[PDB]
């Protein structure tokens, strides 16, 4: 029987899907971080492949038992830990059909369509963001589909660097230097180690409570001056809109004036963030983008596509393609090869195109609002309760809190870990932490696309529940 | 409506299963090629995404007028272009499995089974290659799935160049030597210039048609030479097994002799042909291995996973994890993200594990065993039609040939070309070509899952019907 036989693919699909849809509706009952031990499963599988086929009824019950106990539920309503990973039936009937398709977006030919509809959702998402022309396929930019910011900033980095060792030779790469907030993703200083920047040039400059955490322009300008009368080039500057830890954001436009005095490449990075800015009410959170040559956000973080696809927006195209081309450099119908990293491109873009078609703009916009409307509820009622506090302000839909005691922060650190994993080792939610300005925060993310209200206060309970338990049994200890 | 409704997820998700059933079904009447012009897509679609949601049906609708046309199907069984692209309805399956439970592989603590379920399928597929223990977990290796062959590599350079260049400095950078074949895949020029190697120290060691365009280790240790008299360092190899442009093979066993003289990393590149070593009669194509430090295959390019996934094999996962994890240097259960340049995970290892048990081994094997029979087939008719000429020894499932003519290898490329281009204008079916040691040459890559024996022998008639009318109108003018 052939592997690809349409019969089978029709009776084993309809199998997967009603296994899905069946997780979907079951997924609650499951304890959100998984509870199994390391090895687990090396233990409970064979050491070699099997010799002969297995039905895919003893396959999917494997799955079952084997496989789901051991998954940290991102898809369930309640999870809020690190970022979302946002999915949709949208998103995932377009990685159907792209998988099922299964083309090699090597080049136009090798699917036009693969090619072209990029080029189309790249400008139609754009646009809902209100980007300039210049970084749209109607003006004088482009915009690529990628896996992961990582691999986004890895590109304009190389870019950023080819565009400068051009002009002043090669040899100079050992006094290139990156610029990026305390608070910066550490996809910005792995991008910089496999880019070639040497480790002690990258920047990891100071913020202060007194900005919530947002890089100041005047603190980057006397880095920069510092650098500058150490011997060292300036190259690339990566302000955040939505940082992963308390989601504070850069401030765009006065980084780029100081980068437009030292003629630096500037990368806005909103992972997550840069989705909500196709509500109007949030666009001003990456104004001064038009002076930027970079912009990217993960779709699968914020915008229902499922996992992965983060978008790139860059103002000059070509800038990539001199970098990231393999034809020889007297050679530098869009190639998006040269755009990025991977040479077999997936068919990324019925992802995007099956989003904004099945919700529409109007949806979209209700959606990202309705974890925004949750989470600030849930920040409503931490303020109503005496024995919690807002560590910093919340931007979007992630609140930041910490239990308070009744120095005295190393016992408000220890008071609050320890709160977190007895809520987290429950299995009932999940949230992480992070640790700013030298204070221990939980971190409230509402982005599930599951979750829904009845879920933020079934976690808010929860979190009083057992802070009337720790808060009772104190000792100091 | 919740966009992960398990109910609407459940209806659309049958209802696409049945399209793509329908389209396995019904590959054959389109021409292989797309045949759109450029910009096609961007004429007949809005230059807005809709404010108001559309139905599934009208989307689906789009998808069988405006994106199927505009498609080069892969998987159609009269493809045979470029390599592969291998898929199953098992690897499907994993992939919609991914997709359903859409989780992120940032931690072990992030899905426990997403990092063990690698760790095993790794070991597996390693030991089904007759991998020696140093590349295994249950020794003193390790494995990754990555995206793409070009990441792999990159990961792999960037470990050996931090290994030198911690050694000896990093300000020697400008010094390293990376050293292909001059038929080896760009995806090494891709990887040394995004790791910062400089672009005139790339080596593209010429081949002859006397070694049937494999790399000497003659030659190479000829180069390394010069190199290093020129006050070079030699760092870092990549022999191929099946090369993209004539399935040349490297020798491995010779090349890394030389390399431990010199104290080289040594990567094996068997993107497309590594996938028919688990059979005992091609597993000598992988000879030497054994003394490599990583070895890397494609998947999704003869084994039937779904784009993407790349396998690598490294002997010392230490190398990757102090390249490339953003930990300080001192500190640097598995994490992945420090095996990959990308950070966010996808749970590849479903698509591998679903193909090694829904099929198993011995399935596996014959395959690809019937694939390869197939491609000797071809070679056979080509043999027995004294018009054509197989150019150079077939090694993996692919035939390269020419037209003959009734200086006059000028005249000859022209013919093949022409010829092919009319071929492949027929929409029956499609091959590439390939220049190598100044010859034009027809390439006929069978892999393509539907591909059965009726598939090859038409593709042989058209082949035959053209070579009629072509060389019965034929004048040298």
């Not at 696809?309 to 007297?330: G, I, M, Q, R």
């Not at 009845?454 to 049994?473: F, N, S």
Request: hydrophobic residues 40%.
């Amino acid at each position: 029987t052939n592997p690809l036989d349409p019969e089978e693919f029709r009776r084993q699909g309809h199998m997967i899907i009603d296994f899905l849809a069946d997780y979907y509706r079951d997924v609650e009952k499951y304890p959100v971080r998984s509870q199994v031990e390391p090895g687990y499963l090396r233990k409970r599988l064979p050491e070699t492949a099997p010799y002969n086929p297995e039905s895919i009824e003893t396959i999917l019950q494997d799955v079952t038992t084997e496989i789901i106990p051991g998954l940290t539920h991102w898809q369930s309503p309640n999870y809020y830990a690190y970022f979302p990973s946002s999915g949709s039936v949208a998103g995932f009937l377009g990685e159907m059909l792209s998988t099922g398709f299964n083309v090699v977006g090597f080049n136009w030919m090798s699917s036009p369509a693969a090619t072209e509809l990029e080029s189309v959702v790249m400008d139609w998402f754009g646009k809902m963001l209100n980007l300039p022309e210049s970084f749209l396929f109607s003006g004088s930019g482009g915009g690529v589909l990628q896996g992961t910011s990582c691999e986004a900033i890895l590109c304009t980095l190389t870019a950023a660097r080819d565009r400068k060792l051009n002009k002043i030779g090669r040899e100079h790469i050992g006094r290139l230097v990156v610029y990026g907030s305390d608070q910066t993703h550490c996809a910005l200083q792995k991008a910089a180690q496999v880019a070639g920047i040497n480790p002690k040039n990258f920047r990891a400059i100071k913020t202060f409570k007194e900005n919530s955490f947002g890089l100041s322009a005047a603190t980057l300008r006397e880095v920069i001056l510092e650098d500058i009368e150490a011997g060292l080039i300036p190259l690339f500057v990566c302000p955040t809109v939505g940082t992963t830890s308390s989601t504070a954001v850069d401030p765009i436009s006065p980084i780029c004036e100081v980068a437009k005095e030292y003629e630096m490449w500037v990368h806005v990075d909103a992972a997550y963030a840069g989705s909500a800015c196709i509500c109007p009410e949030f666009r001003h959170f990456i104004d001064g983008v038009e002076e930027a040559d970079s912009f990217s956000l993960n779709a699968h973080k914020w915008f229902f596509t499922t996992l992965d696809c983060c978008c790139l927006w860059v103002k000059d195209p070509s800038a990539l393609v001199k970098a990231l081309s393999t034809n020889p450099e007297y050679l530098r119908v869009v190639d998006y090869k040269d755009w990025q990293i991977a040479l077999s491109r997936r068919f990324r873009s019925l992802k995007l195109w099956m989003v904004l078609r099945s919700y529409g703009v109007t949806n979209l916009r209700n959606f990202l609002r309705s974890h925004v409307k949750m989470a600030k509820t849930f920040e409503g009622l931490i303020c109503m309760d005496g024995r919690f506090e807002i560590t910093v302000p919340r931007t979007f839909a992630m609140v930041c809190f910490r239990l308070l005691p009744p120095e005295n922060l190393v016992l408000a650190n220890k008071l609050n870990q320890v709160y977190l994993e007895t809520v987290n080792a429950t299995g009932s939610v999940y949230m992480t932490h992070a640790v700013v300005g030298g204070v221990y925060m939980i971190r409230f993310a509402v982005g599930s696309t599951l979750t829904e209200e009845r879920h933020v206060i079934y976690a808010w309970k929860i979190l009083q529940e057992h802070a009337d338990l720790i808060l009772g049994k104190f000792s100091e200890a």
